[PDB]
Amino acid sequence: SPPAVPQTFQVAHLHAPTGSGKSTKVPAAYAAQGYKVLVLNPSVAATLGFGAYMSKAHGIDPNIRTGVRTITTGAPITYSTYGKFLADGGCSGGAYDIIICDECHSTDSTTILGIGTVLDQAETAGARLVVLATATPPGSVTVPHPNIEEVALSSTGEIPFYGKAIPIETIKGGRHLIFCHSKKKCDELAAKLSGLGLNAVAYYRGLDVSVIPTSGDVIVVATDALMTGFTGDFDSVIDCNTCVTQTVDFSLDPTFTIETTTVPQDAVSRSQRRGRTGRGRMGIYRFVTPGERPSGMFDSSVLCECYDAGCAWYELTPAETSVRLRAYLNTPGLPVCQDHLEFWESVFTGLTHIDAHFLSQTKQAGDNFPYLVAYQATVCARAQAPPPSWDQMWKCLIRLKPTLHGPTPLLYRLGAVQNEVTTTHPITKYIMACMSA
Ligand SMILES: Nc1ncnc2c1ncn2[C@@H]1O[C@H](COP(=O)(O)OP(=O)(O)O)[C@@H](O)[C@H]1O
Numbered sequence: 001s002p003p004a005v006p007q008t009f010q011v012a013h014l015h016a017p018t019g020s021g022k023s024t025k026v027p028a029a030y031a032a033q034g035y036k037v038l039v040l041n042p043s044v045a046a047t048l049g050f051g052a053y054m055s056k057a058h059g060i061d062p063n064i065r066t067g068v069r070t071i072t073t074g075a076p077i078t079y080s081t082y083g084k085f086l087a088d089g090g091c092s093g094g095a096y097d098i099i100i101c102d103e104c105h106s107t108d109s110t111t112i113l114g115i116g117t118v119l120d121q122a123e124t125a126g127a128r129l130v131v132l133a134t135a136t137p138p139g140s141v142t143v144p145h146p147n148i149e150e151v152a153l154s155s156t157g158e159i160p161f162y163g164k165a166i167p168i169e170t171i172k173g174g175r176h177l178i179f180c181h182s183k184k185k186c187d188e189l190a191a192k193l194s195g196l197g198l199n200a201v202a203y204y205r206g207l208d209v210s211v212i213p214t215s216g217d218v219i220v221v222a223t224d225a226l227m228t229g230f231t232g233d234f235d236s237v238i239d240c241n242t243c244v245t246q247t248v249d250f251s252l253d254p255t256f257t258i259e260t261t262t263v264p265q266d267a268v269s270r271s272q273r274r275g276r277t278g279r280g281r282m283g284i285y286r287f288v289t290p291g292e293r294p295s296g297m298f299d300s301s302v303l304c305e306c307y308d309a310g311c312a313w314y315e316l317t318p319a320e321t322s323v324r325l326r327a328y329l330n331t332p333g334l335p336v337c338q339d340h341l342e343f344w345e346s347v348f349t350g351l352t353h354i355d356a357h358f359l360s361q362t363k364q365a366g367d368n369f370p371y372l373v374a375y376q377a378t379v380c381a382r383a384q385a386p387p388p389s390w391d392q393m394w395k396c397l398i399r400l401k402p403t404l405h406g407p408t409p410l411l412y413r414l415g416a417v418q419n420e421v422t423t424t425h426p427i428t429k430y431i432m433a434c435m436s437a
């Protein structure tokens with residue numbers, strides 16, 4: 001049940017199964033008690049969704065705040081994405097009594113920064129309670145869900161799916177959500193389903209949620225991000241039971257390397273994806289593999305990502321980011337990772353005077369570490385040297401291409417390197433120093 005709230009500031013938790021009502025029934029209850037509530041979610045799709053749903057099912061039309069669209073009603077409940085919250089500068093003084101950090105199991109950099117910011121600023125902004133809500137707290141293991149029938153996929157079916165097969169008869173009619181590990185895999189499966197005469201659509205970042213029909217038969221093939229805390233009224237969920245993790249390798253060549261790999265899903269992912277169905281009614285969950293990997297610590301690369309976002313999108317100095325991240329790591333009941341704040345802080349502290357134009361470009365491009373990418377390009381232009389390669393990651397240097405010659409002043413590795421490398425550049429030495437001492 002939703003924890004009570006006295007005048008004295010407090011941080012509390014809220015654990016309850018998928019689809020039980022943490023994001024809807026709980027804030028509706030606090031409001032009924034006369035409080036002003038802010039509900040922060042990672043997904044813009046789920047956030048926009050709460051607006052029409054609460055109005056139609058809970059007698060209240062809440063305020064909605066997203067980067068692109070804001071809907072002000074003056075209601076005592078506000079739904080916002082962590083990104084919009086951070087972009088507007090954090091906690092608005094005197095605006096809320098209760099702040100719900102929704103989907104706190106999420107380890108994407110925006111949510112980490114967002115929760116850490118709420119933690120560090122809420123009391124000061126006049127709030128009396130902060131709630132850390134999730135159906136999947138640290139160390140949780142997946143258990144049976146009363147509205148979800150789970151059925152293993154087999155080799156019987158005409159659609160190949162991660163070593164298994166999907167029968168067309170199980171997705172022919174009705175609404176279904178199929179999780180794939182990459183955007184490329186979504187496009188490919190959606191294409192095959194369409195070819196077979198089905199109404200399948202792909203949905204991931206870069207795409208508008210309107211591509212999903214609110215009603216009628218449909219097969220949505222998507223990645224995780226936008227599907228967090230989302231209700232699509234799906235008759236079933238089909239899970240590849242596969243994820244894509246990012247990891248930093250201190251390969252000392254000359255500094256560190258950030259790359260991505262495909263891995264079996266953990267307990268958090270299995271429970272959350274399964275929970276897209278069986279929401280308020282019976283549903284079916286089909287899977288490729290049984291069991292699950294334990295839900296443990298997140299990687300240090302995520303911390304690096306927090307400082308990158310702080311510098312590129314939120315106007316946070318590395319010191320300000322450390323304050324917020326420290327609040328997050330010193331709060332019990334949240335995902336944990338090795339303490340490498342001092343390190344990453346020192347690294348970014350030395351990356352000064354970045355080319356504002358290049359940064360704007362990598363940000364608009366949607367790259368993973370727009371700041372490190374843009375800074376490497378900055379270093380290249382300044383030394384009139386070519387980028388590690390001519391992958392789209394380095395496209396902001398194309399116009400300068402005829403003037404770039406010699407080895408690449410490699411600061412770190414964010415992808416394959418093709419050009420000859422040099423490790424004598426100051427910035428490179430600086431990063432090495434951070435890694436050394
Ligand atoms: N956007 C929506 N459209 C239709 N129904 C919704 C929507 N959001 C929530 N619901 C309904 O209310 C229930 C609780 O949803 P929600 O609060 O999002 O769950 P959770 O506990 O995962 O946060 C769901 O089982 C679902 O039936």
Ligand code: ALF
Nearest residue numbers: 018019135229275
């Ligand atoms: F726990 Al949820 F949508 F928030 F299933």
Ligand SMILES: [Mg+2]
Nearest residue numbers: 022023102229
């Ligand atoms: Mg929720």
